[PDB]
Structures are given as structure tokens and as C-alpha cells.
Design a protein around this ligand. Structure first.
Ligand SMILES: CCOC(=O)CCc1nc(CO)c[nH]1
Length: 305
């Protein structure tokens, strides 16, 4: 149909502090959750079935991300490290050391030979997955780095910061290609490339999501009606059915907009705290949502459209 009809299917309990992020495995099999409780949990994507806990970080985790082949995870922790995990064995393969403050955000490149990280230390780091060596340190920002993401061919990195900037980096050289957002304020709390790599979705802490044309460097769409003044809340392109934008919200709801029209097409109610993270299943019309410490649950929602 023209609108989605996401309905609650499962509630996933077990984290003992705020959930920080949820991500679907590229192969659709799994949901991974990270939490302030220092743990990663793996869940069945379709039935919410608890699979395993992955442990090792000495402090809370802000983010977790999947390799392209669904075999590895990378986590970003307040212990100033990232850890690369074998999902099958649950073992830590590498500890990525070099950040001087909390590591907030992380992603594999499509090749999954590199990891990008952003930290409270105001740097972006590019790591070799095989060796766990830091290849490049980018002096990217003048305040904590809120998000990092590679584009579809891995040639570009997009970063965002509380400094109010969105910057695009050449992966090979680490050199800045452009400053896409150049305001003193507000803080840019989230950024990611569109599936096709032509657009950047950016959240600012003035209750606003914006879709930017990367090449032209101008704003194509604005999404409002949600609450976002404090937290680095993820946002998604939903592509399996209708073409939506999905975001959590500080009013404890998930918001879904029509990408083209910018109209809100659904609000998902159930969480009892800030929805910090949403993920869209790679093949099925399924949303995962995760909430802060008054809730500490993950919800799986499914839609016919
Ligand atoms: C327990 C509190 O979790 C958080 O506030 C972390 C949320 C978070 N947002 C991004 C966006 O790149 C990474 N991590």
C-alpha cells in the first residue's frame, strides 16, 4: 500500500542498561544490539530469538556494525577501543587502540578491509581489519564525532560532529573533499550516505532531518515533526517496500516519513524511553527499534507495505 502498517511482533529483553544501537546483518539472519551495559547481543531477525552475548569491552558500547559478509562485528566503546568480533565464535579477533577518548561510531567499508571510527577525541580513524593497525588519523572536527559512514564504492567517508559540520573525506588519501554543512550550530548528530551514494541523510539537534545532494551540495528534502535536541539518533532509508525515512525520537516514538513527499506516514508507539536507534531489514519490511535506560528493550515491527 501507499502507507506502511508496522505492527509490534516481538520485544527483546536482556540488556541491563540503555541500548545504544541495533543493526541487521546484511544476510538478514541476525539483529546485533550494543549497550551501555558493555555487551553485544545477537538475536534472530525474524523471531527475536536470543542467540548469544558477546563480551570483552571494559566500558559501555556506543555502536556496533556488520561486515559485508555478515561474519564480523566491530564495536565502538567508552574504553577508547574498537573490537573486531567473530560472530560465530563470539571471540575478539582484534582490539583497535589509538583514540584518546570515547569511541562513539563505527562502520566497515563495502570491501570490509577497512573500519572507520569517530571519537569524542574529535578525530576519525581508518583501520586495517586484517592487522588491526590504524592506517590514518583525520583531524576531522573540533568537537565529538557523532557518525561515520562509507559510500557504496568505499571511495568516500561522511562524518558529522557537534562542531556543526558534515564533512566528506577521500578514503585513499584521508583529505577533505568538501564541508557539506558549515554552520557554527546546530550540532550534526547523525549522517549517512543513501544506498546509491548520491545523497546524505543528516540529523541536527533542532528536531530536523535533511536529505542533501552530495555532488550539488544542496538540501533536497527536510523531515520534521519528531523530537531530537539531545541524542545522536540514527536514521534509515527503508527500501524493501515503500521508500521511507525512519528515525527514533525523544518522545519515545519511531517516526516514518514518505521520502519524496516528506509527510509522516506512521508513528510506532510502545517504547517507554527515547528511541536512540532504528534499523531496516535488508529484504523484509521489518524495523528494529531500541530505547534508553527506562526501557532497555529492542522491538521488532513488521509491515505488509
Ligand atoms: C546509551 C546511549 O547510546 C547513545 O547515545 C549512542 C547512540 C549512537 N548514535 C550513533 C550515531 O552515529 C552512534 N551511537
Amino acid at each position: 500500500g501507499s502507507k506502511p502498517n508496522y505492527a509490534l511482533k516481538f520485544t527483546l529483553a536482556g540488556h541491563t542498561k540503555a541500548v545504544s544501537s541495533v543493526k541487521f546483518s546484511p544476510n538478514g539472519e541476525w539483529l546485533a544490539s550494543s549497550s551501555a551495559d558493555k555487551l553485544i547481543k545477537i538475536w534472530g531477525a525474524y523471531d527475536g530469538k536470543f542467540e548469544k552475548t558477546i563480551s570483552g569491552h571494559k566500558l559501555g558500547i556506543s555502536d556496533v556494525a556488520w561486515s559485508s559478509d555478515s561474519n564480523l562485528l566491530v564495536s565502538a566503546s567508552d574504553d577508547k577501543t574498537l573490537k573486531i568480533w567473530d560472530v560465530s565464535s563470539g571471540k575478539c579477533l582484534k582490539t583497535l587502540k589509538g583514540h584518546s577518548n570515547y569511541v562513539f561510531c563505527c562502520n566497515f567499508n563495502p570491501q570490509s578491509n577497512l573500519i572507520v571510527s569517530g571519537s569524542f577525541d574529535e578525530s576519525v580513524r581508518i583501520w586495517d581489519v586484517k592487522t588491526g593497525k590504524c592506517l590514518k588519523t583525520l583531524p576531522a572536527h573540533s568537537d565529538p564525532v557523532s557518525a561515520v559512514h562509507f559510500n557504496r564504492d568505499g571511495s568516500l567517508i561522511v562524518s558529522s560532529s557537534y562542531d556543526g559540520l558534515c564533512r566528506i573525506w577521500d578514503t585513499a588519501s584521508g583529505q577533505c573533499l568538501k564541508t557539506l554543512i558549515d554552520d557554527d550550530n546546530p550540532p550534526v548528530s547523525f549522517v549517512k550516505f543513501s544506498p546509491n551514494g548520491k545523497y546524505i541523510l543528516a540529523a541536527t539537534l533542532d528536531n530536523t532531518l535533511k536529505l542533501w545532494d552530495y555532488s550539488k551540495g544542496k538540501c533536497l528534502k527536510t523531515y520534521t515533526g519528531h523530537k531530537n535536541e539531545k541524542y545522536c539518533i540514527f536514521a534509515n532509508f527503508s527500501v524493501t517496500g515503500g521508500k521511507w525515512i525512519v528515525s527514533g525520537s525523544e518522545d519515545n516514538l519511531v517516526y516514518i516519513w514518505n521520502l519524496q513527499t516528506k509527510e509522516i506516514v506512521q508513528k510506532l508507539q510502545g517504547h517507554t524511553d527515547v528511541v536512540i536507534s532504528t534499523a531496516c531489514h535488508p529484504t523484509e519490511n521489518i524495523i528494529a527499534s531500541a530505547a534508553l535506560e527506562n526501557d532497555k528493550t529492542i522491538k521488532l515491527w513488521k509491515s505488509d507495505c
